[model samples]
Target: LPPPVAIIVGHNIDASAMPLTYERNRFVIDMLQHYACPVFSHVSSDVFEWVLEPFPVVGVEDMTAFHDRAYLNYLSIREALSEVDERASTVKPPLRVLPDLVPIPADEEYGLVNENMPFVGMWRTIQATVSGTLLAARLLAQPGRFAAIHWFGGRHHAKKSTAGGFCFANDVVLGVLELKKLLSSDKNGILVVDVDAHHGDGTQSAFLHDNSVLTLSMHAHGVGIFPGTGGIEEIGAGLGRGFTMNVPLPEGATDILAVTLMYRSIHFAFKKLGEGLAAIVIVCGSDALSGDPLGALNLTVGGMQSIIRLLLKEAARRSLKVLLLGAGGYVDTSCARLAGVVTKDVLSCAAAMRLGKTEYFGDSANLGDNLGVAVPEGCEYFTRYGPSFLMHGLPPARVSKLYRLPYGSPLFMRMQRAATKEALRRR
Candidate 1:
């Protein structure tokens, strides 16, 4: 029998200030049902655990392993105090304005100038995401099983000691840290794949020079947005060089382009599976979907299915453990779209992997044997790629060229060099 697959959902994640997250998570399930893929069935309820159920109020102390204690304590107390004043009888302030009234913490004292930099409820979400991700990692460590936790609240902006945008805690970083601890003895390392529309600046910084983990993020460039730092040359420093991969798509990159970029990068990574990387942690942000209020990129519901399907194929090929962490998306519509689509795709992929089977070209051997062209036994790549492209439609040649280039190819390299020169010239 094959190892079991666990799908861990953070129950506490549903209760956020943005009610849309609950809706989005629901949509993830909806999409899963619509796609009717096998992988979705692999998700067991055993992995869906709540972070706050076992513990009372999540505190900075609980996150001390991943965050600074003193700073976290101060921030927690400050938040508590602010919540107290908001309930005062004097005058009720709008939720958006309430944050501005909160005093900025001294950097030397609390590690940030203002709470807005990290996010309003980041600390709370981070704690939940970390606890959930840690649980997922533990399950993946089992010899023959695969597990994933969609720890909601994709706060990619939060750095090791700072926060920004809506991200109060960098769940991706925290999850990676926990995985490192769990897989310390294993020769293979962990791969952190961020498919959010925004560049994962904080995650890249956290493990800039650590080869034990491979960081890949595909997001919008920060030329004029928050935490802007996913440039191509921002490769790893010291021993971590070459492990960090950033593909900052131009604003308005559509579904085809995004998926193509995603697959090509994964192909390169798997083809050159580095030493010490044995598992995968997928940080999914549904904001990249079309019509997202906060997103400039465009991807349809079908686009996401292709991405998830590819990941499952790679995971099976490498026998990789898996964990799925939720990152960013706002409002109810975005949340619903993500949840619905994600659940459908994940379940379908999981089911296929569970069966320990493969399809060739467009024909499923189990579905129909010799009715269609016989799928070459060794042509796994051709079979998977054909379906992905046929389902989502292929991107233009320009996008394909961009996707095919390495992290530091001449085209991207020159773009980076010119951008740097412009910055230096300005200085």
Candidate 2:
């Protein structure tokens, strides 16, 4: 039997600017039930009241803990919508035609707007997103419940005083802070893995000076992308010098590149943090899918699942509590499908581990090589894209070319060594 995993949901999620997330949330819930995995939805329970009751709106007072007070005030009065509109007007017409570059209407019922649309109920959505993530962390904090999923959360692009990349609030940052409070111990640290197509700039910035939270992001390079940050050299600063890691992939990167780089960085981070690593938070974004118009990568559903499997195995190995959050994905159906795949895969892995059949779900040998495995038949999108050689895994040699530092390089090894040394020194 599968372990009970709480699937946090809010009735007002669909009322937010991004209606697509509502569809994705529904797909995940339906798929989890289909797989016979036990799930708990917030819409049907009062479990989230511990965090929601004290702070209902999650207003400027609550957000000021991590965000800039002036910016919080700007958002509270809904003046941010005008600022977004002003920014949109300055963009060149040709560039604005791009899928994610177009600006949304500012006159909507929502307090703010972005490329996505009417920020109607934007504050409410932000509150619920943060509350849902807190609820997941709280659920996983318990003994038996090892994993929880929050399809409505993970707005990682928002920063301390400003919103960009279609994000208005940085829920992941606040969620990490909440987790730390709940743990209430100096030795308990958190590992945040961001698999979103775009870099988790906001979350990384929030923890840039803190070593307790490890932020590792595997994202498409921000050279020509929005919010252009997250480079190889952008590791944390000051006390956080080695805690932040970024594996910036080239455009058109495949699942093999994503998995390989992720595997390397996560192992190094775990070794560096050692026993202090108490929990894992995954920003599972599906924009890397070949079907997504906004994300330029070429990851198939199976390829994405391979990454999910790795995270699950790592979490189970350490018996660490885990929280999964949905991040960036533009294409509605593709996002929903990938969300379902992740939900099913995480629950399946938990069940397998419970039965002591760990290796049954271990990493695959064919992961790094293009075995010419055609996209599984009947995947309408894959069929629509022709034979789609990109759907097949990338060759190992090709995967090697995308890395900034080769595996086992002196510099790479030295960084890992330094991180471990720093962690030990602090201890």
Candidate 3:
């Protein structure tokens, strides 16, 4: 049999601030089981088994590795922590004792502390999120592990010193940093792809000056979004300039556009970064679904599945392990269904590859063979004007040329050259 793909989850995950978050997680596990994927749950004990594990409940000390000390302590205070639970019960806790200490813009930006604190539950949720992601990364960082999915994690918007966008901690950054420690020096090129509706601002910030880790984000344009950051021109700075790639899709972008951009971006990164690529961390958020409350893009279930299949296929071809995390998707039912489909698709693809089925390596349209649901009519919006164009493949030559020339233009080339020069100087 092929190596079992770990589905990291524990009872503590259900303690998240939003009940729907937990519900989506449970729904993902159920659908995975329905697909007959070999699975095992990673509980607190499993996380603690690792020496000096950085699980969140171990307290702010564990988080200091990636977060500022003051910020960590601010969240650890009894008043702040208590407010979270109190608010959940519709009982307002006393005013914060150290209100001035709270990071203003970040508190608003990352949506760290608001009316509904739910500290107790939020605390547990954070711990569980970190635990699952860290454990999954550990497993995949080692040989014999094919892939691991942590539906409860993917708080990508949280920064090292501040929180925003309903994210209190940046588990994606922590997980990738941990994975790097376990990997050999030769495998330094780690690719992080974010398909969340919102930009993975925090994750991108964490590696903004590091060339070893490439951050690619495909999200709604920043013009009218919360936290407004993911611009194509906002590529990395210093040693990481060319390393960061952003595809800011316009509002109402179709599924074909989403998949095409993702495929092309991934292909471009692989080509430029060369063969030292180590692993892939995908922040899969289903908010791009047409009817999503917070999302503005118009992606269907088929589009979402295609994205997952494409990533899985690329990872398999490169013999790289994958760590998948669930990010944003406010619409509980749609989010859960999308997560389930992604999980099933990954497992099915892995199983087929192990069984020597080369067909799985072909066109992504064939991915529907393992998909559980049929595409509902009128579910996807293919264009903003004119007729729908749902056909899947690389973009047309004219469109491809536009992206290619500007993306690889002299400006980026100069930035990359300067970055390489600086690295050589430092060495």
Candidate 4:
């Protein structure tokens, strides 16, 4: 059989922001290249070629498909104000259906139907998020290729007009909407598999009443994280009931537990995949990967690989078009882990570090590429706690030393503020 087609899209966007997210996603693609399984091939950018490259930069124009025009103009204005104030303007509230739109918490500022507008950088991030997801969705629509767009999204807190959680537009929703438009006659909607350590409340809400799309979110639950609404029972309401699936695994769920839950749930969803399940869009959030400082779930690189492999298997079996979108994952160490495992080359990082010089650097060294690494011998007991061993056996002094890095370092601060702002804005 001929190799499967693939599309890649990434470009510098000063206004789009997210340097770290872009770098990490590029790293993910680099890692995937080492697989050399020959099962994948790239499509050319022009004509009917299978592979589609990222648009130079998708901006406000790209966002209009799903966002209100007036709100888009307001977002631009809000961004301009941020430069002078160093603080984002409050975002407008999102759309509401009920007599009482969900009440906005005093401390929180982004989900209500009447919140103020947001600052510039925040709006920029949202625009990029939507553009990236749309770009990926377009590629997935191509005749015969699996398109993966590593857009930094999962800013699930933003409602239609509200800009909360650094997410101005929910890319997950935009991607689905694009797919729906492309396949107008296809009643089968899309499947969103969100594995962001945090619940995808905004994503759920976007399609809450739509029967065409199915949303399955796996996250840390009932713990009061941002937009904390992924209760098991928060399944889609009305006509879209049961279309929304939630698996709020315990806080310290191990890689095995998380993977098991994801596999079971995905498999169940696919089993019912019939007329309305035309494609599968995976919102890949690295935050849940073992070692993400902000994420609570403990998933190893092996476990993440397991999850991806399972999803790919289903995609092939179902003959479903696939779009991969990046959600959230931070932490240098976790990024390193994901980069190393995704390409199935365990030594990629070591080679990048020049720890050893060899022509076989990118070749597999027979190490298992797993989503969740197995617990080491003595660490087996901790599986009950979570699936990570990174924090184990660390001396107090060593831990203190690690946290002592300069608080004002530019690069460090950029990443820190990005994560913090993302968390806060979603509120």
Cα TM-score per model: 0.71, 0.72, 0.74, 0.66
Candidate 1, TM-score vs. the true structure?
Answer: 0.71
Every model's Cα RMSD, please?
Answer: 9.9, 8.0, 9.3, 14.6
Worst 10 residues of 4 by lDDT: 393-402
What's model 2's overall lDDT?
0.65
lDDT tens digits, residue span 241-341, model 4? 87898877555556666777678778767665565677778776777765566566666556666676666555554556666666677653355345334
Query: Residues 37-133, candidate 3, lDDT per residue (tens digit)?
Result: 3332232222111122333345676677688877767666533432333323433347322121222443443345553232444555566677778
**lDDT of model 3 at position 72:** 61
Task: Evaluate model 1: give its lDDT.
Answer: 0.57
How many clashing pairs in candidate 3? 11
Q: What digit string (tens of lDDT, one per residue) describes model 2 on residues 151-249?
A: 778889887766767677788888888777777485578999998888999899999998889899888774586557887788899999899998876
**Candidate 3 lowest-lDDT run of ten:** 392-401
Per candidate, the number of residue pairs that clash is 36, 2, 11, 28
Q: Candidate 4's error at 309, in angstroms?
A: 1.9
Clashes of 2: 2
